[PDB]
From a paper:
CTNNBL1 is a spliceosome-associated protein that binds nuclear localization signals (NLSs) in splice factors CDC5L and Prp31 as well as the antibody diversifying enzyme AID. CTNNBL1 is a widely expressed, highly conserved 62 kDa nuclear protein that associates with components of the RNA splicing machinery. CTNNBL1 comprises a HEAT-like domain (including a nuclear export signal), a central armadillo domain, and a coiled-coil C-terminal domain. Our results identify CTNNBL1 as a unique selective NLS-binding protein with striking differences from karyopherin-αs.
We crystallized full-length human 6xHis-CTNNBL1 and N-terminally truncated 6xHis-CTNNBL1Δ76 (to generate a fragment that is necessary and sufficient for NLS-peptide binding). We were unable to solve the structure using molecular replacement and therefore crystallized selenomethionine-substituted protein for experimental phase determination, solving the structures of CTNNBL1Δ76 and that of full-length CTNNBL1 from crystals with the symmetry of different spacegroups. The crystals reveal the same overall structure of CTNNBL1. However, despite excellent continuity within the protein chain, we were unable to resolve any density for the N-terminal (76) amino acids in the structure of full length CTNNBL1. The N-terminus contains a disordered region and a structured HEAT-like region that includes a functional NES.
Author numbering: 77 to 391, 397 to 563
Amino acid sequence: LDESSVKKMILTFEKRSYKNQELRIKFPDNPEKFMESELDLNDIIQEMHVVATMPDLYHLLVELNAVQSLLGLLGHDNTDVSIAVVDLLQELTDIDTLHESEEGAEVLIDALVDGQVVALLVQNLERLDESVKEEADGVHNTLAIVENMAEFRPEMCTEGAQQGLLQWLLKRLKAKMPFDANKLYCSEVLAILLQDNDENRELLGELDGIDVLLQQLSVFKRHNPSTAEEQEMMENLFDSLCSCLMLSSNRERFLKGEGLQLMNLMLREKKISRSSALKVLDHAMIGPEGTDNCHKFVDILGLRTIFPLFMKSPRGTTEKEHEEHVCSILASLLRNLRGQQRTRLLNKFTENDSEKVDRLMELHFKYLGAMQVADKKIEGEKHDMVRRGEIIDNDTEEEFYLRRLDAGLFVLQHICYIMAEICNANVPQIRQRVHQILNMRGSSIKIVRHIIKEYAENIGDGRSPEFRENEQKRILGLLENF
């Protein structure tokens, strides 16, 4: 159809909108008087879905106050109308369609945001009722809208969350309603809001969200969830929780919500979620800000949980990934721990004639070998690239880095840092053991030292500048007393 067909439609809607509003004001409890215009409005709304197909003429909608009318209509006293509008809004903003016309799309988006679209969607949700199939579908379309908007443009997630979305999502997740498709959807949307968005992580924390997250996870601590969809939800929740843990402010909250105990329990009871519960543990401990958590871990016998996992790797989660988190956690513990807990941790490295140390060195040799092979492969790639005429650029460099990471760079680094910290503790047995074994193959003290220097260069991206010198300093301190 043509902009002759379309331009009609909008203004028709406006008339039908305005008229319906007027009539509804005039006869607040005489249904008879507004009803046929109610139907007229509904029909015109349904017919609009058409417009999605023409992505540019979106610019038009804005101009003739269509958008604004729509936004108002999510407040319309009759849920049948608002659901219909929601559906229309979801069709308009279906992401494939948007990537047809970025100009029509862009201005529509701008209009939508400027109107507090998310806030009005949430208001609508607050009065929807899911025991009624069309309403429940309204919720789903609502969520779909925000998923579409996030995909088209990130910056707004911060504003949207504060516009009551995040809080509603939390309420929905804690709601005592059987798991259903909406809940799953909620779980992914929350995760989408939370990646890279610290004000939302913070906001979640303030909203007491950490508790909520832990309780849902609580649910499947001993048993697995009923269906594949519910397990995907769990994974979603886990992701969200890890995101939240990137913010320092949230480590305290985790601690006081007994997050640590829970994850420990999960690790002991060998659920599939355990692969994730290891990740969570890792996140909960990484930086200086994971110091209290590190100590509490030891207090609750985390050591007994973690060391068996260190000694043996059980086989979605691969062997490498499993080792990675464990070693990372150990690294964090060696960094942050102090006093009795630290002493206890070191005792593990002495025990059974430093079997842990023998483990460590075994791991080292495993990952090192891999690393060597990958780096050789990368060398060969370079040479061939030169021969052909292909220029090594940023994309080729990132691809190489990914390949290296796959081979276990981070875990290697972690191992080596453990080795270093261990040796720096005044324990002859340990140093002897390390040096014994290196010289048992010869290969070697400098290698480790090189590896540690590489690690020191890089991390952190990072949080503070002054911090980053000091950390490098302390790492290098470990290299002399080796």
